[PDB]
């Protein structure tokens, strides 16, 4: 559980997200709920004019001789931040974990420059990621991401990081009316087939095995060449400025804590599976689901790690009236369920017979 190594424990309560963030001077600020703290700066920022010209592409380097650095200390992160400050464009991607965490957390950050690749250990330097704010806030540095919707949110949630002059290569492909996955872009422009196998891997594991180091590196390694090729296609249709505009709108999106609606969320997750239930089974479905979300917040686990969705329906349908019967419905039994089996049993007991 990486959370136990966190310098700051995660607040999972149903309270709007309040961002704590650092500026380019490394000064700490406390933001406001529902307010993106860099909204005024992003809306007042121009695209660097050199980025809007037709330029020859810089091809990706060889994976055999391209320098790759694994960054997992503060000093190595700071050294990396100064290297990035001498670039006009960098390619960024993130790896994330959502099963054994309520809100989820970023596990790894990958960065490529025209001359080298970097892999940042977000877990080991979680508390120090704010040091990247001069790079992410620098308007003269374009930050290239491929399909950044979740990334934009993750950077906020975990590190108080915000992107000034984001360029999203997936938005470029959508605007050119063409396929837009990362694997597609790399195969279309570079004729390289990306390894599918590690998209759903456990990015919390340390050490990272060689195959996963290679997977992480290859997600950014070809992105600046892809960026150059999409720029030429957009100027060949101002479609290039439109894509920078759409990407800026995406950078204005805000992270918001998972939203539990005690009157609605259960229906959204159980959908059609609520048909065939009596009024008391429906009451049990709702209360088990609302309990599952509360217990998920407390354990800092996703609701699925507390109890599978079918287990919620199983309790509702079967109406277990003993701890063992409740344990049968909940298989595979989590610690959260085993420790609170009497509470789940009380939920069922308060609903059987006449209401």
Author numbering: 179 to 415, 423 to 540
Text from the published report:
The exosome is a 3′–5′ exoribonuclease complex that plays a central role in numerous pathways related to RNA processing and degradation, both in the nucleus and in the cytoplasm. The eleventh exosome subunit, RRP6, is a member of the DEDD superfamily (DEDD-Y subgroup) of divalent metal dependent exonucleases. Rrp6 is composed of an N-terminal PMCN2NT domain which was shown to interact with a cofactor Rrp47, the EXO domain containing the catalytic active site, an HRDC (helicase and RNAseD C-terminal) domain, and a C-terminal region responsible for the interaction with the exosome. The EXO domain consists of a classical α/β fold composed by a six-stranded β-sheet flanked by α-helices and the HRDC domain is constituted of six α-helices.
The electron density map revealed the presence of a disulfide bond between the residues C496 and C515, linking α-helix 3 and the end of α-helix 4 of the HRDC domain. In order to study the effect of the disulfide bond disruption on the protein structure and activity, site directed mutations were introduced in the cysteine residues generating the variants TbRRP6CAT-C496S and TbRRP6CAT-C595S. Crystallization trials were performed and crystals suitable for X-ray diffraction experiments were obtained for the mutant TbRRP6CAT-C496S. A complete data set was collected and the TbRRP6CAT-C496S structure was refined at 2.15 Å resolution to final Rfactor/Rfree of 17%/22%. Similarly to TbRRP6CAT the residues 416 to 423 could not be modeled. Superposition of TbRRP6CAT and the mutant TbRRP6CAT-C496S structures resulted in an RMSD of 0.51 Å for 352 C-alpha atoms aligned. The structural changes resulted from the disulfide bond disruption are restricted to one of the helices involved in the SS bond. In the oxidized protein, the short turn that follows helix 4 moves away from helix 3 for the SS bond formation. On the other hand, the mutants C496S and C595S showed activity comparable with the native protein, indicating that the disruption of the SS bond in the HRDC domain does not affect TbRRP6 degradation of non-structured substrates in vitro. The mutants TbRRP6CAT-C496S and TbRRP6CAT-C595S, lacking the SS bond, were also assayed against double-stranded RNA and showed activity comparable with the constructs with native cysteine residues.
